[PDB]
């Protein structure tokens, strides 16, 4: 406790009433004349210290305070996702025990935990020379955190991991758990630092914090204090002023990532460390929304135009891609406008996104699925391709990304509906060239080659099916036709049942001889195809067979929920057809005057049909996020709906962090 | 969060903790023994407990002890007069101000009317809230209120005592009819600054048409002076003039002279309220809505002569700049 060593590189003295020795050391640094007044045996020791503080980024004190720059370098292969380079490092003869400690970390990052548990164990038996407990102590910790990772894996593999993994996997044999359970029983992680020689203690005191949560505590308290200071500064007008709250948050985050990855500590894979980076980055992105919107005069234009959390680099993309979940990112997409946040280093990011797509192919196409690695890696692969919306990628890099997100991605963790959500996000900073549409068209002819049996369906959670992949094609290029889809339409018969419905949903993609031959084979006979007909652009003016069947479905609904309420069941907006009927009646697409008797089936349907009768207490505010441009124009034209739903928007502007509700209010309703 | 949407229970024994805060204040400033070590940590608890008592329901008998410790016995180095009003107003959210507390707030205005026999005492505030606001707090919860001890001080008044002139005039609607009759007899009007210094600051409310005849005479000669200032190059006059007070009292019908439109365009701000139809909105800076009070923003809610213009000119900063207080104007006193 003789000095504060702040995160910028400066030194402020505290609890030092004696002599000031770090005062002397930087007077010896920048003055070569006072140098060589030393001895000879104490001069080769000086070249170690100048190399040491240059690595750790310690600069002169607060008196001679130079302008320090915000830079970071993590020279760790596991941080950058160099998966092939680690496999060529593991399949190589090790020289030292310091190279054994890195392979046991590189196996553990590759999900090869049964080998890393063994490889950490060989370090423990070979680290006998007392050169330093630094190898022996940090391997006891990393092994016990592997065993904690195995034990919570076999609880979620032989336990919950049957219906969510596809089978009852046993990636760890019973002979393995019969070995690792008795070895790690009677092993106290609190007794590891205290049972360790006195040469290790008071020479490695900073490593005692790795046995429990107190290596995160000094940064957790600072993160909670500076969050309230930023949220007070975001409301009181003050920007980032000098050494502000943003750079202190960023540099502590970078020191934690660089201590843990360079020293190969397996604490990188905690939940509590993934929570620290998540709350450290979500504060900096929230402060970045406030520094981009510029209000005050020229004092702040020089203060921070866009730096210290206001600009994004390669190291910031990787932290969000690895340490967030998707609902974590889905928070910030409406609290912040990340599309307005400039992402730099967009060529180093492109090497990261290609390496992930080229490590799904080497994991899900060939044999050896490696289900242990599949648990850890699939979150990072999901969040990287979800957050790849805002980077600008070249054509040779996007082709490996789309061809993995479509084909090689596993269906257990990403269904067919959560592929369209992320293929569409790759059209924000990109268009669809002729090389990416050809990959999507390679995927539609693969599913069409699997729709022979009627038993195969498309389990979609978002309601978005394999027809929307071709709808994303026809959004950009209207003049496109499909080759192999016009060849599969030659075989039309009653043999394969699922070829009937799937080829109908891709009608503008077909050719002239493909569309006419399909209409000669079949026609429309259900309103389910009518909902499919609007999405393919089939029928503009509905024939009165449809308007009969629109209210016929409503009449069967009037049969349905009356006898279903006696049994307690309900089909409220199951397939959203009657809700889509509600928009159709509201946009005056149906000229029937018989739906006044159908009022009283669903709350969404009662909103569109009789807004004077529908009490607006039952209105759900999320419905306004799902209405297009033309629908909100008619709501701006009404008087019955107009001056009442603003009170719903008035309680969502000042109580929800969703910035969409402000946009629906100011652009349409006022 | 929204702490008003949090229900508090055990209010029968939250009150007993808030009374015990009020007694330890009283046992340390009605008494001269101030243990300063205990003062360091107890006042931060006593400050926060009275601050966070906005969200409890108190009694009438238990609220008498809390208000007396807040107004009289709280130390001034921790609560100045600006902050005492911030917290007395917080105690009147869930507890509508009863007559036993209207007595105590009246006791506080008398006890500062007797602290200005010196001419050298100033209420060192920090929030821009002063003794006048406590009088507004009584008038808010009881309009038909006449303070028959502030009346019995402001009548016994002489022109030598100047500090209580600028103190009891700010507490004007609480005084009696005989008490206001004597009090107005010590201040009159001399020059064109004196026609509005005691009104635009003190609200003497001399709303006579002979008074406004000299006001429209001043801006007419200023319009003649504006022609002279236009020949000099700078057509704008002094910014310390009442250029905003021109039309705010005109649109709210405190100036009822018909010759106001003949002197249109004094320097910059005159043409807004006297003529919104023939008004150039490109010269209108919409940052002026900060300097408007609640009622003028409520007054322009029924202003159909600029209703197409005031909505868009407010959005031009709200949709672009990060103005958290301009957004509140669109929410409240607009639409």
Q: Residue holding tokens 């394969």? A: A496
Residue A650, min C-alpha distance to chain B (Å) = 7
> Distance between CA atoms of A305 and A290, rounded to whole angstroms?
11
Chain B positions in Cβ-Cβ contact with residue A636 (cut-off 8 Å): none
Q: Do A293 and B322 touch (CB under 8 A)?
A: yes
Closest chain B CA to residue A662: B319
Q: Which A residues in the span 428-447 are in contact with B, Cβ-Cβ below 8 Å?
A: none
From B311, B324, B335, residue closest to A235, measured CB to CB: B324
Query: For residue A3, what is the DSSP state?
Result: E
Partner residue facing A293 (CB), from B321, B327, B331: B321
CA distance B225 to B271: 17
- Are A473 and A440 in contact by the 8 Å Cβ rule? The answer is yes
In degrees and rounded to multiples of 5, residue A12 shows phi and psi of: -120, 130
CA separation (Å) from A579 to A526, A550, A573? 17, 12, 7
Query: Chain A residues with CB inside 8 Å of B323's CB?
Result: 295
Q: Report the C-alpha gap between A222 and A670 in whole angstroms.
A: 43
DSSP three-state, residue A4: strand
Q: Do residues A578 and A553 lie in contact, with contact meaning Cβ atoms separated by under 8 Å?
A: yes
Instruction: Say how far apart CA B143 and CA B132 lie, in whole Å.
Output: 15
Distance (Å, rounded) from C-alpha A383 to C-alpha A421?
12
Are A670 and B323 inside 8 Å of each other by CB? Answer: no
**CB contact, 8 Å: A236 with chain B?**
no
DSSP string for residues in A7-18: TTS-EEE-S--S
Distance CA A503, CA A494 (A): 14
The alpha carbon of residue A274 is apart from the nearest alpha carbon of chain B, in Å, by 26
B318 contacts A666? CB cut-off 8 A? yes
Question: Dihedral sign, CA of B5, B6, B12, B17?
Answer: negative
CA atoms within 13 A on the CB side of B316: 12
Q: Which residue of B has its CA nearest to A292?
A: B322
Give strand ranges (E) for A501-635: none
- Taking the Cβ of residue B117 and every Cβ of chain A, the question of whether any pair is shorter than 8 Å is answered with no
Cα-based torsion angle of the residue sequence A216, A217, A219, A222 in order, rounded to the nearest 10 degrees:
160
Helix (H, G, I), strand (E, B) or coil at B206: coil
Q: CB pairs below 8 Å between A and B: how many?
A: 21
The beta-carbon contacts of B69-78 under 8 Å, at least 24 apart in sequence, are B69/B21, B69/B22, B69/B23, B69/B25, B69/B26, B70/B22, B71/B104, B71/B105, B71/B107, B71/B108, B72/B107, B72/B108, B72/B111, B73/B25, B73/B26, B73/B28, B73/B29, B73/B30, B74/B25, B74/B29, B75/B29, B75/B43, B78/B43, B78/B47
> How does DSSP assign A406-421, residue by residue?
IIIS-TTTS-SSTTHH
Q: Do A646 and B335 touch (CB under 8 A)?
A: yes
CA B222 to mean position of chain CA atoms: 30
Distance CA A589, CA B125 (A): 66
Residues contacting A159, CB < 8 A, separation 6+: none
Residues 6+ apart with CB under 8 A from A418: A461, A462
Look at residues A390, A316, A405 and name the one whose alpha carbon lies nearest to residue A354.
A405
**Whole-angstrom distance, CA of residue B66 vs CA of residue B292:** 35
Cα-based distances in Å from A233 to A85, A238, A308, B48, B219? 45, 5, 16, 22, 44
Residues 281-320 of B with CB under 8 A from A: 311, 315, 318-319
- How far is it, in rounded angstroms, from Cα B335 to Cα B324? 18
Contact list in B for residue A235 (CB cut-off 8 A) is 324
Q: At what angle do helices B11-29 and B61-68 cross, to 10 degrees?
A: 40
Instruction: Give the strand pairing for A11-13 and A3-5.
Output: antiparallel
Residue closest to B330 by CA, chosen among B317, B311, B316? B311
- Residues A54 and A56: their CA atoms lie apart, in Å, by 6
Query: CA–CA separation, B65 vs B24, rounded Å?
Result: 11
For A39-46, the CB contacts below 8 A with 24+ separation are none
Contact A666 B331 (CB under 8 A): no
Nearest to A6 by CA among A278, A311, A243, A217: A243
- Concatenate the DSSP letters of all residues of A252-297 into one string: HHHHHHHHHHHTT-GGGG-SHHHHHHHHHHHHHHHHHHHHHS--S-
What residue has token string 């009170």? Answer: A647
Phi, psi of A413 (to 5 degrees): -105, -10
Select from A285, A292, A377 the least CA-distant residue to A331: A285
Alpha carbon A150 to chain centroid distance? 24
CB A602 within 8 A of CB A573: yes
Nearest chain A residue to B323, by CA: A295
CA–CA separation, B232 and A357 (whole Å): 74
Is residue A473 within 8 Å of A437, Cβ to Cβ?
yes
**Integer Cα distance of A303 and A487 in angstroms:** 63
- Tell me how far apart the alpha carbons of residues A244 and A236 are, in angstroms, rounded to a whole number: 15
What distance lies between CA B188 and its chain's CA centroid?
23
Angle, to 10 degrees, between the axis of helix A97-109 and the axis of helix A133-154? Answer: 20
**Which residues of chain B make contact with A653, given a CB cutoff of 8 A?**
327, 331
Where do we find the tokens 């991605």? A409
The DSSP letter of residue A542 is P
Cα gap B87→B113, rounded to integer Å: 21
CA-based end-to-end distance of chain A: 61
Structure tokens at A89: 């490092």
Instruction: Give Cβ neighbours of residue A106 (< 8 Å, ≥ 6 apart).
Output: A77, A78, A86, A89, A90
Q: What is the resolution of this structure in A?
A: 2.9
Burial label for A191, CB within 10 Å (0-12, 13-18, 19+), is exposed
Helices A245-262, A272-292: crossing angle, 10 deg rounding: 150
A653–B contact, CB cutoff 8 A: yes
Partners of residue A287 in chain B, C-beta under 8 Å? none
Phi, psi of A3 (to 5 degrees): -150, 145
- HEC states along A148-208? HHHHHHHCCCCCCCCCCCCCCCCCCCHHHHHHHHHHHCCCCCCCCCCCCCCCCCCCCHHHH
What's CA A581's distance to the chain center, in Å?
36
| Euclidean distance between CA atoms A633 and A667, whole angstroms | 10
Q: How far apart are the first and last CA of chain B?
A: 26
Question: Greatest CA separation found in chain A?
Answer: 104
Tokens linked to A634: 């008619």
CA separation for the pair A388, A336 (Å, rounded): 16
- Which chain B residues contact residue A646 at CB under 8 A? 335
Cα dihedral angle (B213, B219, B223, B229), rounded to 10 degrees?
Answer: 150
- Find, among B67, B56, B143, the residue nearest to B93 by Cα: B56
Asked if A655 is an interface residue toward chain B (Cβ–Cβ < 8 A), one would say yes
Nearest CA in chain A to B322: A293
Instruction: Region of A36 please: left (phi>0), alpha (psi -120 to 50) or beta.
Output: left
H-run or E-run covering A5: strand A3-5
CB pair distance less than 8 Å for A295 and B323: yes
Q: Cβ contact (<8 Å) for A654 and B331?
A: yes
């Amino acid at each position: 406790y003789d000095y504060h060593f702040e995160v910028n590189g400066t030194v402020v003295r505290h609890k030092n009433k004696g002599f000031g020795y770090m005062e002397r050391f930087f007077e010896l640094k920048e003055s070569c004349d006072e140098r060589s007044k030393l001895s000879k045996k104490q001069y080769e020791r000086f070249n170690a210290l100048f190399n040491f503080f240059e690595k750790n980024g310690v600069i002169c004190m607060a008196k001679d305070a130079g302008t320090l720059n915000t830079s970071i370098e993590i020279n760790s292969l596991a941080y950058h996702g160099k998966y092939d380079v680690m496999k060529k490092f593991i399949e190589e003869q090790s020289v030292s025990i310091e190279d054994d400690y890195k392979k046991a970390f590189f196996l553990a990052c590759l999900g090869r935990w049964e080998e890393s548990y063994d490889l950490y164990s060989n370090i423990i038996l070979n680290s006998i020379d007392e050169s330093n407990g630094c190898v022996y102590y940090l391997s006891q910790i990393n092994r016990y955190r592997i065993y904690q990772s195995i034990t919570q894996a076999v609880t979620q593999f032989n336990g919950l991991g049957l219906l969510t993994f596809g089978r009852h996997y046993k990636p760890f044999t019973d002979e393995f758990l019969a070995r690792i359970e008795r070895e790690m029983t009677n092993f106290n992680i609190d007794d590891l630092f205290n049972g360790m020689p006195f040469e290790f203690q008071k020479k490695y005191k900073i490593l005692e914090f790795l046995s429990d949560n107190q290596f995160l505590y000094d940064d957790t308290v600072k993160l909670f204090e500076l969050t309230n200071k930023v949220r007070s500064e975001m409301s009181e007008g003050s920007y980032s002023f000098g050494m502000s709250s943003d750079i202190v948050v960023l540099l502590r985050l970078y020191d934690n990532l660089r201590f843990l990855y360079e020293n190969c500590l397996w604490s990188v894979s905690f939940h509590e460390f993934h929570q620290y980076i998540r709350n450290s980055m979500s504060l900096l992105i929230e402060k970045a929304e406030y520094e981009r919107t510029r209000d005050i005069d020229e004092l702040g234009f020089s203060f921070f135009g866009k730096k210290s959390g206001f600009f994004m680099e390669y190291y910031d993309f990787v932290n969000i891609s690895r340490h967030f979940k998707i609902d974590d990112i889905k928070n910030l997409e409406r609290s912040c406008s990340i599309d307005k946040i400039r992402f730099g280093e967009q060529e180093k990011i492109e090497e990261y996104l290609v390496g992930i797509a080229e490590e799904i192919t080497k994991q899900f196409s060939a044999n050896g699925m490696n289900v242990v690695f599949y648990t850890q890696f699939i979150s990072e692969a999901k969040a990287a391709l979800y957050f790849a919306k805002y980077v600008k990628l070249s054509e040779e890099g996007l082709g490996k990304i789309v061809k993995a997100l479509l084909f090689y991605f596993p269906e257990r963790d990403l269904d067919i509906g959560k592929r369209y959500v992320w293929l569409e996000r790759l059209t924000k900073c990109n268009e669809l060239p002729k090389s990416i549409i050809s990959i999507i068209d390679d995927f539609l002819v693969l599913q069409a080659e699997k729709h022979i049996d009627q038993n195969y369906s498309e389990v979609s959670s978002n309601g978005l099916y394999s027809r929307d992949y071709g709808a994303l094609i026809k959004h950009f290029e209207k003049n496109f036709i499909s080759k192999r889809l016009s060849e599969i339409t030659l075989c039309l018969t009653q043999d394969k049942q699922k070829q009937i419905d799937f080829l109908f949903k891709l009608l503008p993609l077909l050719s002239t001889n493909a569309k006419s031959h399909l209409l000669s084979f079949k026609s429309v006979e259900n309103i389910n195809d009518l909902m499919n007909g609007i999405r393919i652009g089939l029928i503009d003016e509905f024939t009165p067979e449809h308007e009969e069947l629109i209210i016929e479905y409503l009449e069967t609904r009037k049969v349905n929920y009356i006898v279903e309420k006696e049994k307690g069941i309900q089909t409220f907006s199951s397939n959203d057809y009657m809700s889509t009927f509600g928009i159709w009646y509201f946009l005056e697409e149906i000229n029937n005057s018989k739906m006044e008797e159908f009022i009283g089936m669903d709350d969404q349907y009662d909103f569109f049909v009789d807004p004077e009768n529908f009490d607006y207490k039952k209105f759900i505010p999320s419905w306004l996020k799902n209405y297009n441009d033309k629908l909100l124009g008619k709501i701006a034209g009404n008087k019955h709906m107009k001056h009442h739903v603003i009170e719903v928007l008035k309680e969502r502007v000042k109580n929800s962090n969703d910035k969409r509700y402000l946009e629906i209010l100011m652009n349409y309703f006022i």
